[PDB]
Write an enzyme that holds these catalytic residues in place. Structure first.
Site, PDB file in Angstrom:
ATOM      1  N   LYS A  16      -5.784 -11.990  13.830  1.00  0.00           N
ATOM      2  CA  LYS A  16      -4.433 -12.452  13.470  1.00  0.00           C
ATOM      3  C   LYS A  16      -3.333 -11.391  13.347  1.00  0.00           C
ATOM      4  CE  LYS A  16      -3.531 -14.868   9.471  1.00  0.00           C
ATOM      5  NZ  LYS A  16      -3.015 -16.027   8.685  1.00  0.00           N
ATOM      6  N   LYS A  35       2.900  -2.794  13.254  1.00  0.00           N
ATOM      7  CA  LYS A  35       2.085  -3.973  13.537  1.00  0.00           C
ATOM      8  C   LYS A  35       2.082  -4.335  15.018  1.00  0.00           C
ATOM      9  CE  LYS A  35       1.561  -7.618  11.035  1.00  0.00           C
ATOM     10  NZ  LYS A  35       1.759  -8.856  10.230  1.00  0.00           N
ATOM     11  N   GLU A  84       8.063  -0.906   7.161  1.00  0.00           N
ATOM     12  CA  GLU A  84       7.965   0.082   6.099  1.00  0.00           C
ATOM     13  C   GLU A  84       6.503   0.235   5.700  1.00  0.00           C
ATOM     14  OE1 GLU A  84       9.178   0.478   1.338  1.00  0.00           O
ATOM     15  OE2 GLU A  84      10.219  -0.954   2.638  1.00  0.00           O
ATOM     16  N   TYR A  85       6.080   1.468   5.448  1.00  0.00           N
ATOM     17  CA  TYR A  85       4.697   1.748   5.077  1.00  0.00           C
ATOM     18  C   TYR A  85       4.553   1.911   3.565  1.00  0.00           C
ATOM     19  CZ  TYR A  85       0.948   5.095   3.949  1.00  0.00           C
ATOM     20  OH  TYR A  85      -0.092   5.773   3.349  1.00  0.00           O
ATOM     21  N   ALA A  86       3.596   1.196   2.978  1.00  0.00           N
ATOM     22  CA  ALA A  86       3.351   1.263   1.534  1.00  0.00           C
ATOM     23  C   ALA A  86       2.136   2.132   1.196  1.00  0.00           C
ATOM     24  CB  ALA A  86       3.179  -0.133   0.959  1.00  0.00           C
ATOM     25  N   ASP A 129       5.109 -18.230  -0.410  1.00  0.00           N
ATOM     26  CA  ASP A 129       3.766 -17.745  -0.110  1.00  0.00           C
ATOM     27  C   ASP A 129       3.344 -16.576  -0.994  1.00  0.00           C
ATOM     28  OD1 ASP A 129       1.343 -17.995   1.221  1.00  0.00           O
ATOM     29  OD2 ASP A 129       1.912 -16.607   2.826  1.00  0.00           O
ATOM     30  N   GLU A 133      -2.480 -10.839  -1.753  1.00  0.00           N
ATOM     31  CA  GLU A 133      -2.578 -10.191  -0.444  1.00  0.00           C
ATOM     32  C   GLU A 133      -1.257 -10.186   0.321  1.00  0.00           C
ATOM     33  OE1 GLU A 133      -5.344 -13.768   0.025  1.00  0.00           O
ATOM     34  OE2 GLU A 133      -4.079 -13.028  -1.616  1.00  0.00           O
ATOM     35  N   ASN A 134      -0.204 -10.683  -0.321  1.00  0.00           N
ATOM     36  CA  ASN A 134       1.141 -10.603   0.234  1.00  0.00           C
ATOM     37  C   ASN A 134       1.936  -9.532  -0.483  1.00  0.00           C
ATOM     38  OD1 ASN A 134       1.212 -12.346   2.393  1.00  0.00           O
ATOM     39  ND2 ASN A 134       1.856 -14.124   1.187  1.00  0.00           N
ATOM     40  N   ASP A 147       4.873 -10.336   3.334  1.00  0.00           N
ATOM     41  CA  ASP A 147       4.856 -11.396   4.348  1.00  0.00           C
ATOM     42  C   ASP A 147       5.955 -12.443   4.175  1.00  0.00           C
ATOM     43  OD1 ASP A 147       3.126 -14.377   4.945  1.00  0.00           O
ATOM     44  OD2 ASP A 147       3.689 -13.013   6.566  1.00  0.00           O
TER      45      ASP A 147
HETATM   46  O1  LIG Z   1      -6.376   0.513   2.570  1.00  0.00           O
HETATM   47  C1  LIG Z   1      -5.518   1.275   2.275  1.00  0.00           C
HETATM   48  O2  LIG Z   1      -5.838   2.466   1.608  1.00  0.00           O
HETATM   49  C2  LIG Z   1      -4.061   0.969   2.611  1.00  0.00           C
HETATM   50  C3  LIG Z   1      -3.723  -0.211   3.281  1.00  0.00           C
HETATM   51  C4  LIG Z   1      -2.384  -0.478   3.581  1.00  0.00           C
HETATM   52  C5  LIG Z   1      -1.380   0.423   3.208  1.00  0.00           C
HETATM   53  N1  LIG Z   1      -0.006   0.159   3.601  1.00  0.00           N
HETATM   54  C6  LIG Z   1       0.815  -0.804   4.316  1.00  0.00           C
HETATM   55  N2  LIG Z   1       2.206  -0.692   4.307  1.00  0.00           N
HETATM   56  C7  LIG Z   1       2.962  -1.583   4.989  1.00  0.00           C
HETATM   57  C8  LIG Z   1       2.361  -2.586   5.673  1.00  0.00           C
HETATM   58  C9  LIG Z   1       0.954  -2.687   5.693  1.00  0.00           C
HETATM   59  N3  LIG Z   1       0.208  -1.823   5.029  1.00  0.00           N
HETATM   60  C10 LIG Z   1       0.098  -3.638   6.286  1.00  0.00           C
HETATM   61  C11 LIG Z   1      -1.206  -3.114   6.397  1.00  0.00           C
HETATM   62  C12 LIG Z   1      -2.222  -3.900   6.952  1.00  0.00           C
HETATM   63  C13 LIG Z   1      -1.923  -5.203   7.390  1.00  0.00           C
HETATM   64 CL1  LIG Z   1      -3.204  -6.211   8.102  1.00  0.00          CL
HETATM   65  C14 LIG Z   1      -0.618  -5.720   7.268  1.00  0.00           C
HETATM   66  C15 LIG Z   1       0.400  -4.938   6.718  1.00  0.00           C
HETATM   67  C16 LIG Z   1       1.820  -5.452   6.573  1.00  0.00           C
HETATM   68  C17 LIG Z   1       1.752  -6.929   6.184  1.00  0.00           C
HETATM   69  C18 LIG Z   1       2.373  -7.905   6.970  1.00  0.00           C
HETATM   70  F1  LIG Z   1       3.102  -7.550   8.065  1.00  0.00           F
HETATM   71  C19 LIG Z   1       2.277  -9.256   6.620  1.00  0.00           C
HETATM   72  C20 LIG Z   1       1.558  -9.645   5.487  1.00  0.00           C
HETATM   73  C21 LIG Z   1       0.935  -8.675   4.695  1.00  0.00           C
HETATM   74  C22 LIG Z   1       1.031  -7.320   5.047  1.00  0.00           C
HETATM   75  F2  LIG Z   1       0.442  -6.372   4.258  1.00  0.00           F
HETATM   76  N4  LIG Z   1       2.921  -4.836   6.735  1.00  0.00           N
HETATM   77  C23 LIG Z   1       3.347  -3.480   6.445  1.00  0.00           C
HETATM   78  C24 LIG Z   1      -1.720   1.612   2.552  1.00  0.00           C
HETATM   79  C25 LIG Z   1      -3.063   1.878   2.244  1.00  0.00           C
END
Ligand SMILES: O=C(O)c1ccc(Nc2ncc3c(n2)-c2ccc(Cl)cc2C(c2c(F)cccc2F)=NC3)cc1
Length: 256
Positions: A16, A35, A84-86, A129, A133-134, A147
């Site tokens: 997905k 993504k 954006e990266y978290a 939503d 996990e969001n 999301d």
């Molecule tokens: O495991 C670790 O140590 C880890 C994991 C993730 C992060 N950071 C991060 N930052 C931004 C995003 C994502 N992850 C992210 C990561 C994976 C996936 Cl499958 C989706 C996304 C998304 C997202 C999205 F588009 C729709 C809904 C939910 C989302 F989370 N969007 C940006 C840091 C450490």
């Protein structure tokens, strides 16, 4: 924008309908999350209007607590989503590792959400939503909404847990739907799982429709009240954000 302006890092997720990799914008070394999506699985689901409509919404939102969508671009057969990266990761995993959150951590996440949502509720956008996990975490440890797969304009089939009676009873609903999720969510932050949990989709409906929840003994009265106020069946009984942001328990425990 080409996929060659970036340097794919380590994978962070899978779906997905593609993958999310760490990435560095080559010329500015700007760190971000990228993504991927295959147009294949796209039309195979036809949800392309959504992607365009979801990317649509998110692309025009500004908040410290709402994950940003800088841009996008498609090539030969892929769709690319510049996000954006978290740094701190996902709130879901964190909850998994810790089991539940102390009142202070919970109380603050709520305050941040309340703002992000108070904000959305003024741009006339409703998330709908809201779920662990969001939610992801900023480098300072703060909450970030990720999301928008559903979030729509209003007053206006997956996991039934965070949906209110109106959503579920195919009824007419509005901005107060998010205030129900905030309740459910709060509960999960504190208990370790949702109020209306059930082994079966069918019976969750029942638990949710009849608003049947109980607290563990360890839940403090300060919380119970808030959650109860938030889980009112009638959407009108549901308080408004300000009140939430200014609830005794919220104030006595929040960092913001
Ligand atoms: O495991 C670790 O140590 C880890 C994991 C993730 C992060 N950071 C991060 N930052 C931004 C995003 C994502 N992850 C992210 C990561 C994976 C996936 Cl499958 C989706 C996304 C998304 C997202 C999205 F588009 C729709 C809904 C939910 C989302 F989370 N969007 C940006 C840091 C450490």
């Amino acid at each position: 924008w080409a996929l060659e302006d970036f340097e794919i890092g380590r994978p962070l997720g899978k779906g997905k309908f593609g993958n999310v990799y760490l990435a560095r914008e080559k010329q500015s070394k700007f760190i971000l999350a990228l993504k991927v999506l295959f147009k294949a699985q796209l039309e195979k689901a036809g949800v392309e209007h959504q992607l365009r409509r979801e990317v649509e919404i998110q692309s025009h939102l500004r908040h410290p607590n709402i994950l940003r969508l800088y841009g996008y671009f498609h090539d030969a057969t892929r769709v690319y989503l510049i996000l954006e990266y978290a740094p701190r990761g996902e709130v879901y995993k964190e909850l998994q590792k810790l089991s539940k959150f102390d009142e202070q951590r919970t109380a603050t996440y709520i305050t941040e959400l309340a703002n992000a949502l108070s904000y959305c509720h003024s741009k006339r956008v409703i998330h709908r939503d809201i779920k662990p996990e969001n939610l992801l975490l900023g480098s300072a440890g703060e909450l970030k909404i990720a999301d928008f797969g559903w979030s729509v304009h209003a007053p206006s089939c997956g996991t039934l847990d965070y949906l209110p009676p109106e959503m579920i009873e195919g009824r007419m609903h509005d901005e107060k739907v998010d205030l129900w999720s905030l309740g459910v969510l709060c509960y999960e932050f504190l208990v370790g799982k949702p109020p209306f949990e059930a082994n079966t989709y069918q019976e969750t409906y029942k638990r949710i429709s009849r608003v049947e929840f109980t607290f563990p003994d360890f839940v403090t009265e300060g919380a119970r009240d808030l959650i109860s106020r938030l889980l009112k069946h009638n959407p009108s009984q549901r308080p408004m954000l300000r009140e939430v942001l200014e609830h005794p328990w919220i104030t006595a425990n929040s960092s913001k």
